[PDB]
């Protein structure tokens, strides 16, 4: 069969690219002393989440290659936990980055206390703790469902629980973060468009204007990659659609589209930044 083979090749390509990129990013941020700023903490935590997902993906590539799941239940639990961490922590980190950019650009005078290297680590720990509290149910109910075949899935105690899960994820994963991000940037734009000099010198103004644009482009790429998945899920929940053979290709396409985003992020930092490019060159060459 061709579909399984091409989707396995794509999974392995994605895994290799993402592992290389995120390992390079983590190493560069931890090794050098010029690269220790307030935004690189959030970038580092995003990279750690993507690295965990990249360590988990080969088992899903295997399961899609041969339809059986031969690895047991203890591995199923861990792969479901990592998939939840990938879905939730990445958006929570992007939300905190956007709030940080708002504080840095619009309120530079008052917010000088909330931007200190001791206060960012507490916010990162709170991000992880809230993410784990949100993940807890899929961690509890993950298991194996027998079709001779076995599959790693979530066995809801039911259906109504599936329709509840779709809404629970659509509301805590897409809507509430995007509203906050949209408000932050709607306010940031007016301020930039009106002011002449942001911080009193041309160098600080220039750096602020570069970093804000990089962050906005990262968020736009995220939205682009994760929109069709939610459109499809909510469309299937709302109206009754009887499954057809055409309903599998669309689902596989949108899922692998979501998976591609983790690979995409370590490539932007090379074009849209200069310190990251200098460091990547100094390390690799």
């Amino acid at each position, epitope marked *: 069969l061709t579909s399984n083979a091409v989707l396995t090749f794509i999974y392995f390509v994605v895994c290799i690219i993402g592992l290389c990129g995120n390992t390079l990013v983590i190493y560069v941020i931890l090794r050098y002393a010029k690269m220790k700023t307030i935004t690189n903490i959030y970038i580092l935590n995003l990279a750690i989440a993507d690295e965990l997902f990249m360590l988990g993906l080969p088992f899903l590539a295997m399961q899609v290659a041969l339809v059986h799941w031969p690895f047991g239940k203890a591995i199923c639990r861990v792969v479901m936990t990592v998939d939840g961490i990938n879905q939730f922590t990445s958006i929570f980190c992007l939300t905190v980055m956007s709030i940080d950019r708002y504080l840095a650009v619009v309120h530079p005078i008052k917010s000088a206390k909330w931007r200190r290297p001791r206060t960012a680590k507490m916010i990162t720990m709170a991000v992880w703790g809230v993410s784990l509290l949100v993940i807890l149910p899929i961690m509890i109910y993950a298991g194996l469902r027998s079709n001779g075949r076995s599959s790693c899935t979530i066995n809801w105690p039911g259906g109504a629980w599936y329709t509840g899960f779709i809404i629970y994820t659509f509301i805590l994963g897409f809507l509430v973060p995007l509203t906050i991000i949209c408000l932050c940037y709607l306010f940031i*734009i007016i301020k*930039v*468009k009106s002011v*002449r*000099l942001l911080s009193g010198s*041309r160098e600080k*103004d*220039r750096n602020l*204007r*570069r970093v*804000t*644009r990089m962050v906005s482009i990262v968020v736009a790429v995220f939205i682009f990659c994760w929109l069709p998945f939610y459109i499809f899920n909510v469309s299937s929940v709302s109206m009754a659609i009887s499954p057809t053979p055409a309903l599998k290709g669309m689902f596989d396409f949108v899922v692998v589209l979501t998976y591609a985003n983790s690979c995409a992020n370590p490539i932007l930092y090379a074009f849209l930044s200069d310190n990251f490019k200098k460091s990547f060159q100094n390390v690799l060459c």
Partner: nanobody, 86 residues
Framework: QVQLQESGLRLSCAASGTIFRLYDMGWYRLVASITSGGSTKYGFTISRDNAKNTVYLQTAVYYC???????????????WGQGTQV
């Protein structure tokens, strides 16, 4: 990127090109300057029309100077002009 043309008492300076916004303009021998909000500062009379990006002022050489950005996420630059004989 920007282009500044001077004319000719009455002196006039006009700007054209690929511009996003125009900040304070001035005439140098500092002889005149006008902030983007009419807040003039001498040290004649100087006026500014922001509909066409033009600055008017009413012996030696006199140059024109402007400040500009080419985008919203870019750096502040300033452009000079040619000379004129009074």
């Amino acid at each position: 990127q920007v282009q500044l043309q001077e004319s000719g008492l009455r002196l006039s300076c006009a700007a054209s090109g690929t511009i996003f916004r125009l900040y304070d303009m001035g005439w140098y021998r500092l002889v005149a300057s006008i902030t983007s909000g009419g807040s003039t500062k001498y040290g004649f009379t100087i006026s500014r029309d922001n509909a066409k990006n033009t600055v008017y002022l009413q012996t030696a050489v006199y140059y024109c100077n402007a400040e500009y950005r080419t985008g919203i996420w870019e750096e502040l630059l300033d452009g000079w002009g040619q000379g004129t004989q009074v």
